[PDB]
Amino acid sequence: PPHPQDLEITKLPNGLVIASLENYSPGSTIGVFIKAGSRYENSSNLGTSHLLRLASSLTTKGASSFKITRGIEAVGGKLSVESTRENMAYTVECLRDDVEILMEFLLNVTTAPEFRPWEVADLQPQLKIDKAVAFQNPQTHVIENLHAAAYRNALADSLYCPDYRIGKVTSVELHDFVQNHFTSARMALVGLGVSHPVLKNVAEQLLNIRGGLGLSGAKAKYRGGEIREQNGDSLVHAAIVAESAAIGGAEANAFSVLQHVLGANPHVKRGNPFDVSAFNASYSDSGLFGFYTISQAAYAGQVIKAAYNQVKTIAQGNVSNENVQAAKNKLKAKYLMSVESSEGFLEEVGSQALAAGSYNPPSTVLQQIDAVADADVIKAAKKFVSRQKSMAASGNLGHTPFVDEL
Amino acid sequence: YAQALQSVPETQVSQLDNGVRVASEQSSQPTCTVGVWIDAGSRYESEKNNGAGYFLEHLAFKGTKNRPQNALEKEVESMGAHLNAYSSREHTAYYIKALSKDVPKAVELLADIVQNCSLEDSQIEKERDVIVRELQENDTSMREVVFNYLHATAFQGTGLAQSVEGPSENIRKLSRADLTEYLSTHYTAPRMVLAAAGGVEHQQLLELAQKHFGGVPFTYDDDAVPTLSKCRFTGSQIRHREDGLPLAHVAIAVEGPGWAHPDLVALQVANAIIGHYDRTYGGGLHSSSPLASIAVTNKLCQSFQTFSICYSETGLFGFYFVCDRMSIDDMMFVLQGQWMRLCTSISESEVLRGKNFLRNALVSHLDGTTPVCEDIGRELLTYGRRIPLEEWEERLAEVDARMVREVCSKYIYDQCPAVAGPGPIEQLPDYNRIRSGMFWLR
Amino acid sequence: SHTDIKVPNFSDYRRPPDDYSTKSSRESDPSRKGFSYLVTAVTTLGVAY
Amino acid sequence: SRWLEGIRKWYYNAAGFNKYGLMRDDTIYENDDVKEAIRRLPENLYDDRMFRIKRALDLNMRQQILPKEQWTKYEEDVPYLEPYLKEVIRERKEREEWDK
Amino acid sequence: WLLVANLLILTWIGSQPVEHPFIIIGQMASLSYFTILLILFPTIGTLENKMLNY
Amino acid sequence: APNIRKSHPLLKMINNSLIDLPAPSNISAWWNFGSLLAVCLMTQILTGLLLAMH
Amino acid sequence: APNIRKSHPLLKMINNSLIDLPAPSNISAWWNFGSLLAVCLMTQILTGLLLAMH
Amino acid sequence: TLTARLYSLLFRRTSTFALTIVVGALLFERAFDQGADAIYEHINEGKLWKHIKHKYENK
Ligand code: HEM
Ligand code: HEM
Ligand SMILES: CCCCC[C@H]1C(=O)O[C@@H](C)[C@H](NC(=O)c2cccc(NC=O)c2O)C(=O)O[C@H](C)[C@@H]1OC(=O)CC(C)C
Ligand SMILES: CCCCC[C@H]1C(=O)O[C@@H](C)[C@H](NC(=O)c2cccc(NC=O)c2O)C(=O)O[C@H](C)[C@@H]1OC(=O)CC(C)C
C-alpha cells in the first residue's frame, strides 16, 4: 500500500541467517551467500574455489546438469555465482511463482553437488580461459599480485586458479572444500521480492549440514611485498598499499572518507594524460588502502610519486573540515546509489546478514559515517605514510620506481 | 506477480506551454536520477555537420557561462551527483543522479547545459585532439567498428550510415560556431524530455523545470518537430579484411520496422529464442538456443549476440558473432540457418521460454533509478508516451508460435540482408551464398 | 581510422531506378525479386519442357 | 522350476567370451551410449579393459585361447561399465523427453 | 546355421521338380527363411541379452 | 559437423568440386571448355550407349 | 613430405588402401572374401571384355 | 501488380515456386507446341501429308 515491509531476519537453530524483504518488484531474486572463498586454500588445493565457482552448473543429486540449465532457462531464469577472496554469493533471479521453481536448482547447486569426476575433469580446461578473459583487464592482474605482495598465507592466495594447477584440482578437493565451508553457520539464504514465511519454509530442505566453522581461514599476516611484472604495455598500472581497516572495524569508515578526501587531490595533483585513485579494500581480519595509478610509461615515475606526496601531505595537515563534509556526503551517495539495483542492493542485505546477523538501517549507517570526520582522516592518512608499504606493478616499468625509492 | 506489475506506480507526464515533456516515476528511494533526453543525434548531421553532436557531448560538461568549468564540476562533485550521458544516431541524453534532495538543483544544472555551454574556443581546440585520440581508440574495438560498418553499408548513402562519432576531417575542423549551430538548432524543448525516477514528487519537478526551462516559442516552427529523411536500406556487404587480427567479426541483418510497429514485440521474442552465447557461460546443454548449443558442440564462436536495434522509422534486426579465422563459415551456416528454422518451424514450447526470458529482461531492463529514467527518457521520445511493464507484459504475453513465424519470416525470409565483417574472414563465402541462406529449401 | 570509411556511390552506376534513397528499399524490391526470380522460374520452366 | 540364475550361468559359459578372458561389458558393441559410458570410466578400469581387449584380440588373432585357469568365472565377472552406461541412458532418456 | 542350411535347402528344393515330396518342403523352408530373419534372430537376440542381465 | 555437405564421404566430394570449390574470380569462357568437354563425354556415352542398343 | 607415398594425390590413395591402411590384427579368411570378389570383378571384366571381342 | 503478386504468392515459398514450374510447364508445353506446330505447318502449306492426305480425302 506504500510498499514498506520491514526486512525480517530469523537465525535458524543452525546458524543459517534467513533475510528476506518483500519489496513488491515483479522480479525477485534469492541468494545463498557463504563465507567460502580463496582465503581457505593451502599451498595445495589452490584455485579449488575458483573451479568450484564454475562447477556451478555441474550435476547435483536433485537435478542433472541438463535439467538445471534448461530448467532455469525454461523460466527466464538466471543463475550465476559471484565470489571474492573470502565469500561466495550464489544468486538466482526470476519472477512470480517461478521463484518457487527457480529454487529447486539453487538448493541443489549449493548443497548436493555431486561433482562427477568426468564433468569436472572435462570442465577444468575452462579455467584457462575464464581466467584468460578476466586477465585482459590489466587492473585485475596488478591486484591479484598486490594481495600476493601484501600478504603471505591465506588471503594472499589468488582469486583465479594459478596456471600450474589448471587441471590438477581433484573432484575430491571440491567436496572436501565444500563439506568444510558450505555449512549452516556460515551461510545465508538472503532474498528479495519474497514473503519471509516462504523464504523460511525453504531453509527446511536447506538443512543438510551443521558444522559451524569447518576449516576457518588462518589469520592474515601482513608483508611489505613488491612484485613487478615487466611486460611493456605502453602504459603502467601501479598500486601501493598499507595494511589496514577491517569490515566492522571502527577504524574503517575513516579511510572511506579518506578514500574520498583523497582523489580530487591525487588526481588534480598530477597533471598530464593519466588516471589515479584512492584504493580501499576492507577484509574480515584485515584490509588495504592505497592508490592505483594507470599512467603512460615514461611518465609512470612522476605519476605515482606525485600521487604519493599527496597521500603524504594529506597526513601532514592539508584537509579542510570542508573536504570532509563534501567527501562525507559522496559516500552517503555512492552508498545509497549503489543500492538502487536490486543486485548491488541484495548484496547489502546479504553481506550484513552474514558477517553480523543484523541490518544497519540507512539512518544509522549514516549516523556512523556522519559520526566521524576531522577526528580521524588526517590521521588515517598518517597511518599510511608510516606503516609498511607493498607495491604491485604491470607495464614497461623501466621508468617506474620501487618502494625503496618511496 | 501480475498484481506486482499492477501495483507498479504509474508514470506522470505533462508538457510545458514551452514544449518540453516532463515525466518521471516515484518510489521510496532517497536517491534518484534525472535527465534531459534530446531527439538529437548523428542522423541529424550533415556531410560537414557530422561529428558535432559528439564534439558537443564532449563539452557539454566542461562548463557553462553562468558557472565555468572548475565550478560546475566542483558544484557537481561537491554534492555527490553523477552527471553522465551519451549521443547515439537519433538519441542523446544527459542524466544526473543525486539524492532527490537535489531535484531543483540537478534540474537547474541540466538546463544550464542543454542551453548554455561555455564552448570555450580554447576548451574546444583541446577536446578536438582528445576525440581524435579517443576515436583512434574506438577503432580497435572491432566489437564496434563492425557495427558502424554494418550501418555504413546497411543504410549506405543516407543519414544513419554516418557514425555517431563522425570523420576525422570534421572533428579536425569543426568551428566554435558549427557546435553552437548544432546546439541552437536541435536542443529544443519540443524534442527534449525531462524524466526522472526515485523519491521525487512530480509537481516539485515540474515547477523546477517549469522554472529553469523558461523557454518561449514564438513562431509555429519552434513548436514543430521536423520528421527525418527516410533512410534506404541496402542489402549489401562491406568487408574490411585483415588476417592480421586475432579473429574476425561478422554482423548481418535485415531492415527493422521502427519503434512504433507493434511487431517489434513478437520480433523481440524472436531474438529471445536464439539469444546469445559467450564461452564463459556454462552450457553445451543450453536452452533451445541451438545457436548457443551448436556453438558449443562444434566450438563455433567466441561469442554471438542477437539484436533488433531499431530507430524512429527504420531498424536493424540481425545477429553478430566473433569467431576464429577458421570456424567462421560453419557458424554463419548454423546461425543463419536458425533464422530460417525460427520462422519456418518454430514451436510453442520454444516461444514459451522466449517470452519468460524477455519478461525477465523486460523487468531487469528497469533495475534502479538511472535505468528507469532511461525508458521514460526514451519511451516518450520514440513511442509517444510510457509503456508500463503491465503493458509490455500483455504485448508479449500474447505472442504465440504461429505469431513469431508469421513475423520473422515477414522480415527475414528471402530478404536481402546486410553483412559486415572485419578480420581474417577469407573463410566467409560470398554474398549470393549467405544470401540464398535466407530461404529454406522447404 | 574507420569512421572515415564509406560505401561509395553505386547509385546509377548500378542500382535499379527504384533505389535512390528517401524511400524504403523494401516494398519496392519485394517486387524486383519477383522479376529476377520470374526469369529463373521461367528458365526452370523452359528447361522442364 | 528352472533358475534364471541357473540359466545365466549357462549362457555365460556358453557365450564363452570369458575363454578369451574378458568381462561381459568388455564385449557390448560400442554404440553412442557405451562410448560415452566408457569415456566416463575411471582411468584405472580403462587401461584395464584396454589390455583385456588387446589381449583378447591378440589371442583371437592367434586362433588360440586362454588356459582353462585364466578364464574368468561367472560370479567373478565385474560389470565395470553397466553402472555408468545406465546413468548415461537415463540421462539421455531424460533429455530426449525434455526436448518434446 | 539353421539359416545357412535353410538356404542350402531352398536351393536343393529349387533344383527339384514340383511334387509333394518337395513343394511343401519348399514353401516351408521358404518360410523359415523369412521368419529366421524377420523374427527368430531379433527374438533370440534380445533374449540372449537378458541371459546376461541386459 | 552440422554441415553434412561436408560430413558425408560421398556428399562431400560434390560440395567440394561443385560447391565450395575455390575458383579464380576472373575467368573467361575459355575456362568453360572442359565442363563442356564433360557434357560431351556424357552426350557421347549416353547417346552411344543407346546407339549400341541397336 | 619426403614420403611421396603420401605426398602424391594418386600415389597416396594406394599407400592408403593397400599400404598403411589400419586393419584389425585378428581377421579370418572370411575377410578375404571381398578382395576375392574384386579378382572376380576383374577376371570377369577382363575375360568378358575379351570374349566380347568375338 | 503481377510481379509483386507473383513473388509473394508464387516465388516466395520454395514449396510454391516449384509447384508453378510444374503447372506452368504443362501450360508452356501445350501452348509452345500448338504454336510451334502451327508456325511450322503454315510455313509449308500444301506440302505436308496432312495437306495432300486429301487427294484421297479432299482439298
Ligand atoms: C568418347 C566419345 C565417343 C566418341 C569420340 C564416339 C565417336 C563415335 C563416332 C565418331 C562414331 C561413328 C559415327 C558416324 O558414323 O558418324 C561412333 C559410332 C558409334 N559409337 Fe561412338 N563414340 C563415343 C562414345 C560412344 C559410346 C560411349 C558408345 C557406347 C558404348 C558408342 C557407341 C557407338 C555406336 C553404337 C556407334 C555405331 C553407330 C554409328 O556409327 O553411329 N560411342 N562413335
Ligand atoms: C560382372 C561380371 C560378369 C558377370 C556376372 C558375367 C557373367 C556372364 C555370364 C554368366 C555369361 C554367360 C556365360 C555362359 O554362357 O555360360 C556372360 C557372357 C558373356 N559375358 Fe559376361 N559377365 C560379366 C562380365 C562381363 C564383361 C565385363 C564383359 C564385357 C564387357 C562380358 C562379356 C560377356 C560375353 C562376350 C559373353 C558372351 C559369350 C558367353 O556366353 O560366354 N561379361 N557373362
Ligand atoms: C555425380 C556428379 C559429380 C560431378 C563430376 C564433374 C565435376 O568435376 O564437375 C565440374 C567441376 C568439372 N569442371 C569444373 O569443376 C570446372 C573447373 C573450373 C572452371 C569451370 N568453369 C569454367 O568456367 C568448371 O566448370 C567438369 O569438367 O566435369 C568433371 C569432369 C566431372 O565429371 C566427369 O568426371 C564426368 C565424366 C567422367 C563422365
Ligand atoms: C589401381 C589399383 C587400386 C587398388 C583397388 C582395390 C583396393 O581396395 O584393394 C583392396 C584393398 C580391396 N580389399 C581390401 O582393401 C581389404 C580390406 C580388409 C581386409 C582385406 N583382406 C582380408 O583379409 C582386404 O583385402 C579389394 O576388395 O579391392 C578393391 C575393391 C579395390 O579395387 C576394386 O575397386 C577394383 C574394381 C573396381 C575393378
PDB file of N, CA and C in Angstrom, chain E residues 15-35:
ATOM      1  N   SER E  15      16.317 -77.038 -57.309  1.00  0.00           N
ATOM      2  CA  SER E  15      16.779 -77.870 -58.399  1.00  0.00           C
ATOM      3  C   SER E  15      15.898 -79.095 -58.439  1.00  0.00           C
ATOM      4  N   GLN E  16      14.736 -79.010 -57.802  1.00  0.00           N
ATOM      5  CA  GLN E  16      13.820 -80.141 -57.758  1.00  0.00           C
ATOM      6  C   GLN E  16      12.434 -79.843 -58.311  1.00  0.00           C
ATOM      7  N   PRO E  17      11.932 -80.677 -59.230  1.00  0.00           N
ATOM      8  CA  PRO E  17      10.616 -80.518 -59.851  1.00  0.00           C
ATOM      9  C   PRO E  17       9.535 -80.348 -58.809  1.00  0.00           C
ATOM     10  N   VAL E  18       8.354 -79.874 -59.199  1.00  0.00           N
ATOM     11  CA  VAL E  18       7.301 -79.664 -58.212  1.00  0.00           C
ATOM     12  C   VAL E  18       6.331 -80.808 -57.871  1.00  0.00           C
ATOM     13  N   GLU E  19       6.652 -81.603 -56.844  1.00  0.00           N
ATOM     14  CA  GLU E  19       5.788 -82.696 -56.376  1.00  0.00           C
ATOM     15  C   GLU E  19       5.767 -82.708 -54.849  1.00  0.00           C
ATOM     16  N   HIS E  20       4.709 -83.276 -54.256  1.00  0.00           N
ATOM     17  CA  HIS E  20       4.553 -83.333 -52.782  1.00  0.00           C
ATOM     18  C   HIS E  20       5.816 -83.601 -51.982  1.00  0.00           C
ATOM     19  N   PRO E  21       6.621 -84.575 -52.404  1.00  0.00           N
ATOM     20  CA  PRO E  21       7.849 -84.861 -51.660  1.00  0.00           C
ATOM     21  C   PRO E  21       8.589 -83.561 -51.411  1.00  0.00           C
ATOM     22  N   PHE E  22       8.556 -82.676 -52.408  1.00  0.00           N
ATOM     23  CA  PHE E  22       9.184 -81.363 -52.348  1.00  0.00           C
ATOM     24  C   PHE E  22       8.127 -80.340 -51.989  1.00  0.00           C
ATOM     25  N   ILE E  23       7.869 -79.462 -52.953  1.00  0.00           N
ATOM     26  CA  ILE E  23       6.888 -78.381 -52.864  1.00  0.00           C
ATOM     27  C   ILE E  23       6.671 -77.862 -51.467  1.00  0.00           C
ATOM     28  N   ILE E  24       6.049 -78.686 -50.634  1.00  0.00           N
ATOM     29  CA  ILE E  24       5.784 -78.324 -49.253  1.00  0.00           C
ATOM     30  C   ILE E  24       7.101 -78.034 -48.582  1.00  0.00           C
ATOM     31  N   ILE E  25       8.015 -79.006 -48.604  1.00  0.00           N
ATOM     32  CA  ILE E  25       9.321 -78.765 -48.019  1.00  0.00           C
ATOM     33  C   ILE E  25       9.653 -77.354 -48.435  1.00  0.00           C
ATOM     34  N   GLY E  26       9.502 -77.112 -49.734  1.00  0.00           N
ATOM     35  CA  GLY E  26       9.773 -75.803 -50.293  1.00  0.00           C
ATOM     36  C   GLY E  26       9.145 -74.687 -49.496  1.00  0.00           C
ATOM     37  N   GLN E  27       7.909 -74.351 -49.820  1.00  0.00           N
ATOM     38  CA  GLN E  27       7.253 -73.285 -49.111  1.00  0.00           C
ATOM     39  C   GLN E  27       7.549 -73.307 -47.620  1.00  0.00           C
ATOM     40  N   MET E  28       7.902 -74.455 -47.062  1.00  0.00           N
ATOM     41  CA  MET E  28       8.224 -74.455 -45.647  1.00  0.00           C
ATOM     42  C   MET E  28       9.516 -73.669 -45.451  1.00  0.00           C
ATOM     43  N   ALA E  29      10.644 -74.230 -45.892  1.00  0.00           N
ATOM     44  CA  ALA E  29      11.953 -73.570 -45.747  1.00  0.00           C
ATOM     45  C   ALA E  29      11.817 -72.140 -46.212  1.00  0.00           C
ATOM     46  N   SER E  30      11.015 -72.002 -47.257  1.00  0.00           N
ATOM     47  CA  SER E  30      10.718 -70.726 -47.862  1.00  0.00           C
ATOM     48  C   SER E  30       9.767 -70.004 -46.909  1.00  0.00           C
ATOM     49  N   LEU E  31       9.911 -70.285 -45.623  1.00  0.00           N
ATOM     50  CA  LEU E  31       9.071 -69.662 -44.627  1.00  0.00           C
ATOM     51  C   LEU E  31       9.963 -69.487 -43.435  1.00  0.00           C
ATOM     52  N   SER E  32      10.757 -70.517 -43.167  1.00  0.00           N
ATOM     53  CA  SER E  32      11.719 -70.477 -42.079  1.00  0.00           C
ATOM     54  C   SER E  32      12.696 -69.366 -42.454  1.00  0.00           C
ATOM     55  N   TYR E  33      13.007 -69.307 -43.747  1.00  0.00           N
ATOM     56  CA  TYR E  33      13.903 -68.303 -44.283  1.00  0.00           C
ATOM     57  C   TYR E  33      13.536 -66.972 -43.696  1.00  0.00           C
ATOM     58  N   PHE E  34      12.394 -66.462 -44.128  1.00  0.00           N
ATOM     59  CA  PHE E  34      11.898 -65.190 -43.646  1.00  0.00           C
ATOM     60  C   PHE E  34      11.906 -65.101 -42.140  1.00  0.00           C
ATOM     61  N   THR E  35      11.077 -65.922 -41.509  1.00  0.00           N
ATOM     62  CA  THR E  35      10.998 -65.932 -40.059  1.00  0.00           C
ATOM     63  C   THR E  35      12.376 -65.910 -39.399  1.00  0.00           C
TER      64      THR E  35
END
